[PDB]
Design a protein around this ligand. Structure first.
Ligand code: FES
Ligand code: FES
Ligand code: FES
Ligand SMILES: [Fe+2]
Ligand SMILES: [Fe+2]
Ligand SMILES: [Fe+2]
Lengths: 180, 433, 180, 433, 180, 433
């Protein structure tokens, strides 16, 4: 993964605002545990990917991320994501019952157009603050590389693809019971 | 100070009692690094992690950073990732290829064997380089898996494993082509003792057959299916090793567990077809029906844990009495179809990664236990390890070795008993099989 | 406190900019210890509220936050806030003398119109970084639910109401000597 | 390692000297959880936190997690929040209502009494369930306040409190209906020793009447008034308990303390009207001018601290020698009007929450002291506890017990003396009153 | 350094967006280790400055920041910055080989005009998340004060001046191997 | 318990061996604060940090906070930043001017000398104020540099330094006007033992002449030049103190060392002109060629490290065995031009601050060593300190004292020998110079 290929001419003010507002609405859903409403944003062909990141010398920097044939933190389809939603909303799902307290702070939104109409490549930065039980605090940072499609929902868009690049090699959290 | 008499009182396999201090005490942990981790065979990875000459993997042996490297003569060598001059880390990346290793502090040059070949200004300022190389470990490979041991007086890997080997072969020796590891090493941190994690994979199917994974199975079963039809697996067996504290537990015939976790394609591959029948012939002489074994857990003492049917392997690296790092990878048959290899990759991420629908609930339990053990009264009374006591037999008509019921703690009692032995017996003369 | 009910018609570009700019200005006032200048933004009928947050099972999730009749971290009026301003600007106010170093990073701003003209319900997320003395670092995250009136001042708006939903049960900090 | 002789040398009530090592030493702290917190009556909250059948509250005794829960027969039971199988937390939420408690690990089921009622696969794998329930604590209530103790050999709560009961009754015994706790419990973490906090509410009015809370009073007094007009109360008395290490301090006649902190409406309620007259009538047997008593502070040894005038109550949960958790709630009269309850609620948040105008300066002092105690020379010389030395007498016509001047350290010396006794005397035969 | 004196008449929607996007593009360059590309943004007369910050009583609060004739964390010109770029891109630069994983979260952008055409004074807040080697995490927060000039590069602007106000007295990180 | 016999075996200067436990052991560190830091001369800063009456500086002696304050009679007084009442910090800011000091807890007032002058309510509640002032330390100043020592048994600063004074005067005595400290003090945290940092500036030129600072030199050389040409220095000497464990190392006749770090304008001032003429004339008793000495490192035991040719001065404050705080500042001549003062200011930020092109690589090494020392096997074998063993002699025409080759560890062995002596010998009679 290299520097995001931003367009020279930036996206229009209305488009920039629309996508920024989509992420703010998405963050609200996740932070208030509206998992069913959030899951409805995911298209049937969703690929939800979070690769492993390794420590490499500069000369071996091309091998920093795990590939498509390798293990990952997440490598999901619509089918497997539904299972995760059924687990996280479950009363016997102990990892999130009692549920965690999360905050998705979203910024650095860069919008790029595609060859397909009403479909956008979007780059954004995040800090995910996760507070759990009595004193457990986990802080995550990284970027999201999304393919978004315009949709007739309450948020304005639907998610076709999502790659999450976490600023971590070894995960300092005991789990990833949250969604990015 | 911990006397041999006091250490023996921490574990009582006869009454099935465990002293909770073993998971929390700092002094005991420091003794563990010397007496347990300093002389046990410890899993570092797989042969396929270091396939070519100069290929390396930076990993751990307890809290000692180690470098595992393939040599010119196809051998694998393991040495301490520490420069003997002033302690600097020689190999500073996770994995890759090297023609040589060089210390970034003062420029002490090493070859890929871990031998000191060059010291800057040696003729001007100095001493023998052959005596000042990083501490080498004993290396032994068992059907793909690479183990290492510091102690020269320790028994060889084959003897160390003993009659637990046929149970390792259920995952490792199904095809003449052997096993290969899928790329990528998952790493995360859990604030708990290593013994909880090691014991769970050793003897604890009880948690999976009760309350821990009710949401995990729900995540794996069809959208139209609920926990009522999920099928409750109750039948199965548990194995305790004759020596080593090794243990394994598995379900028998009941397919409801493996189907939910690994899906229909893997479950079929494991039970019915040309691949499963080849494993039946190869492992039949050990007196074990592998096609009946559906969903399994195993621990090689101290910290090598794997799940044969799902092919999930992990090393627990201790980080004090209150913390561990989990280093996990996945194995597939070397000659297995691409479709089966992909289903293994996908489902292992889904179930067993840091965000895995099973792993999430496993860590959650251990975190809360470790927090509890900070209190005085929480360590004052022994834990119950009495399940299946005096119910295991070494003459079982279906499975070899000391075999009991799937929901028992015989392998758990054997693990903590061997732990107690290694912690109280300083010499290998009395400790050996 | 459920998911913030954002309007389907997103706020206009100018109004979105104005309210975001107000928060950035407010953050600058707080981060540079302009307490008297910040206090002037608070209206006379202000309710400054930070409820307690508890670990609850999903079955008892409606009791996550403390109520109106319960204890809170903050439950302040204009007069009580005046006392806090007089304390924080005092030489004998040891908790903030020497003063802390703070950073209010504001994002996720969602703007909602109300029945009263020039009065808006605003939802936003924050990360508050508090550095104190030699080595002390306290990190807070949460969301703010404000009622903002249009005012003729340096910032463009006044604060009618503020509710802070902090992502914490037990507070990891020894005190709350900062303003949210 | 600490011998009884060495522990006695840490505290000297005759010379008024305290060894600073008592706040920092890790060995001493480990002994405290055994010798002090393991056998003391510890505050868990109030009866109104658990008013109906099945209602529970997850709290702590020292570092041991416990469950306080109301039974069907109106009784309250306290047990260790730890499953005796492998140490998992039984009650995983803060507070609520339960029909039965179940473990998430292996599914061991418990009733609200804490008894083990069901074990999954018990008839297949196994032992007595009546013997394998979590450890029970002794439960005793003093006029609403629920206390707990592990030790069966320890004295009853009534004798434990001793002659400190009259001063507890100033806050607790004012109406026939009793007190009720305002919902919600404030929790925060302070990096200091528990003894600093316990001593301050025990014997330290000296901090509130000098420099610590000068900005806190400034926040409370009318906007037109500045600090130069604010009253400086000097008249008052301090109380040392006959046994236990308890202590209380109060201002006499001067309302400047209460009027600034609690406001004009609370001060009116506390000193004037039928509500104040009935309280004096109810506390006639003690023989105290309770309407003249304003701005009181009290500590029930070791960690139950409250302010009888402003009705702020808090427990100090130890988290090592260098850390505490403060758990704070507020009490009001049950039959009190809505205007008074709202006044108590607002002013207790304004003053005594984590963001309170008083608490901010309280913790700021403690954080600095603990940081200082990391140094060698900072723990080499004793702290001065010589205030009011040999001035307190039992022959006071207004207040019972060992009574001295408000700005004194007699109750402090008594607190550290009783601490010294608990740490050095292993048997109750010598320790008890 | 006092509260950033923002203009009453706020910057236009187009200008606000252009500068925000510049910072998001800049963050992407830094977070993906494009050091050569990022250095190109620095003008010849750049002053890159990060003053020391000290704990002072309110009575002596004017001595908080280090002066012009005092030591600093950074005090750099174009030539000294060039040497830093040559070190960080070097295979023998051990502090960043293997390199760190960083995230520059940018928000709170306030835009002010100057006397010189196409030259802008900009204030913004940041959280910099730095993850190094196995488990090392360093979190920084503060504000940046930039003088930006319009440039015909792929980002739209060039950096003439930058002052970084970091919310720390004693630095909790072992180094400052990153750029702000 | 560390017996004197066990401590002596940790360091072997005869064979050149160092036991790695010295950097990691918690018990050894506890003794260091008493045996090493509690009775050594420790740097607090410069006279110019506190130039006028009432000026103070809050700094550290080990883990003890101290206040260094200029008096009315132009003297400097150093006392413990701890109130003897209940341990509160008396001086709560970094630096500034005070007419008096007052505790914020109970209002105990102090004069600028560190003497208890006023106690609130003393007459009513109480003991002599003259006895209860904060612990005073011995204050000695060597040509600007302020040192402090708790122990009255310890020898004076002049005797403490010994024959290390001439090498200090290279930086501290070039003009009759003396030196002045540039404003501001850089502070950052490194997770490593203090001895790694103390040894490097004591004896370790070996890291700078090899691999550690390859990218640091690259940053300072002109864009038209690369590391291929970069002149590599090989000629130089190393000094070991007769007593103290003080050490110094410098290059001889090689401009490329100073040119890359400090630039041409600093080198012109240091080697040429009337300023360098006066420096060699004032330092005539030594017989040293100070105009030919470029790129010097020096450590005054235990934690005073500086770089004379670039005027980088720093103190290592210990924070447990696994952490330190670096407090660094810079010196210039009092009558130095405004051009040269700015050159020293800019280049010291560029090179030796937390983000400095040299300092980044220094810390990176130490951080990684400390991590490795968590393991058992990583502490089981001694480190090599055999460099330049038995090659140093006291008969040198230009540089006085025990002088060897620049790339040696004679001064390093001298440091650890003196460390061992202080840790093992309780009395100053055997320890004296
Ligand atoms: S530490 Fe390896 S060369 Fe000095
Ligand atoms: S720990 Fe509670 S059932 Fe196993
Ligand atoms: S601590 Fe300084 S006066 Fe009480
Ligand atoms: Fe499991
Ligand atoms: Fe107080
Ligand atoms: Fe160096």
């Amino acid at each position: 993964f290299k520097t995001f290929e931003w367009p020279s001419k930036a996206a229009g003010l209305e488009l920039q605002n629309e996508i920024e507002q989509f992420y703010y609405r998405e963050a609200q859903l996740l932070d208030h545990r509206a998992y069913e409403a959030w899951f409805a944003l995911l298209d049937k062909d969703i690929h939800y990917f979070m690769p492993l990141r390794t420590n490499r010398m500069i000369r071996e920097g091309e091998l920093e991320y795990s590939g498509d044939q390798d293990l990952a933190h997440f490598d999901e389809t619509h089918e497997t994501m539904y299972g995760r939603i059924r687990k996280v909303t479950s009363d016997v799902g102990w990892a999130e019952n009692p549920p965690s307290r999360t905050r998705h702070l979203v910024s650095n939104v860069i919008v790029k157009e595609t060859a397909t109409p009403d479909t956008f490549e979007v780059n954004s930065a995040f800090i995910l603050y996760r507070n759990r039980l009595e004193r457990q605090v986990d802080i995550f940072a990284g970027e999201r590389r999304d393919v978004l499609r315009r949709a007739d929902n309450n948020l304005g868009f639907s998610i076709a693809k999502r790659t999450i690049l976490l600023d971590a090699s070894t995960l300092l959290s005991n789990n990833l019971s949250m969604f990015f | 100070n911990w006397t041999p008499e006091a250490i023996r009182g921490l574990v009582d396999q006869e009454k099935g009692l465990l002293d909770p201090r073993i998971y929390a005490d700092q002094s005991l942990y420091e003794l563990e690094l010397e007496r347990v981790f300093g002389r046990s065979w410890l899993l570092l990875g797989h042969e396929s992690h270091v396939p070519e000459t100069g290929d390396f993997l930076a990993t751990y042996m307890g809290e000692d950073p180690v470098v595992m490297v393939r040599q010119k003569d196809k051998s694998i060598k393991v040495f301490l990732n520490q420069c003997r001059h002033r302690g600097m880390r020689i190999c500073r990346s996770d994995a890759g290829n090297a023609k040589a290793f060089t210390c970034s502090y003062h420029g002490w040059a090493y070859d890929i064997a871990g031998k000191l070949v060059n010291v800057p200004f040696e003729k001007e300022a100095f001493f023998d380089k052959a005596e000042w190389g990083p501490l080498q470990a004993r290396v032994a490979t068992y059907k793909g898996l690479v183990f290492a041991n510091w102690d020269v007086q320790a028994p060889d890997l084959e003897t160390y494993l003993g009659d637990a080997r046929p149970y390792m072969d259920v995952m490792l020796d199904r095809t003449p082509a052997g096993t290969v590891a899928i790329g990528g090493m998952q790493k995360w941190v859990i604030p708990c003792n290593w013994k909880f994690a090691a014991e769970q994979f050793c003897s604890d199917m009880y948690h999976a057959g009760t309350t821990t994974h009710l949401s995990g199975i729900l995540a794996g079963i069809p959208p139209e299916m609920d926990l009522s039809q999920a099928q409750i697996p109750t039948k199965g067996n548990q194995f305790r090793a004759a020596w080593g504290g090794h243990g394994s537990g598995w379900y028998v015939d009941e397919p409801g567990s493996l189907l939910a976790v690994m899906g229909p394609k893997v479950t079929q591959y494991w039970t019915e077809g040309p691949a499963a029948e080849l494993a039946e012939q190869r492992l039949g002489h050990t007196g074990m029906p592998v096609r009946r074994m559906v969903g399994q857990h195993m621990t090689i003492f101290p910290t090598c844990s794997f799940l044969p049917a799902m092919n999930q392997i992990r090393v627990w690296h201790p980080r004090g009495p209150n913390e561990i790092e989990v280093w996990a990878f996945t194995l597939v048959d070397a000659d297995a179809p691409a479709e089966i290899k992909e289903e293994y990759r996908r489902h292992n991420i889904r179930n067993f990664s840091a965000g895995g629908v099973f792993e999430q609930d496993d860590g959650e339990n251990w975190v809360e236990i470790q927090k509890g053990l900070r209190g005085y009264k929480a360590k004052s009374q022994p834990f119950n390890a009495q399940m299946g006591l005096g119910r295991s037999q070494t003459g079982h008509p279906d499975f070899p070795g000391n075999v009991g019921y799937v929901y028992a703690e015989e392998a758990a009692r054997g693990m903590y008993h061997h732990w107690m032995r290694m912690m109280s017996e300083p010499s290998w003369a009395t400790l050996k099989p």
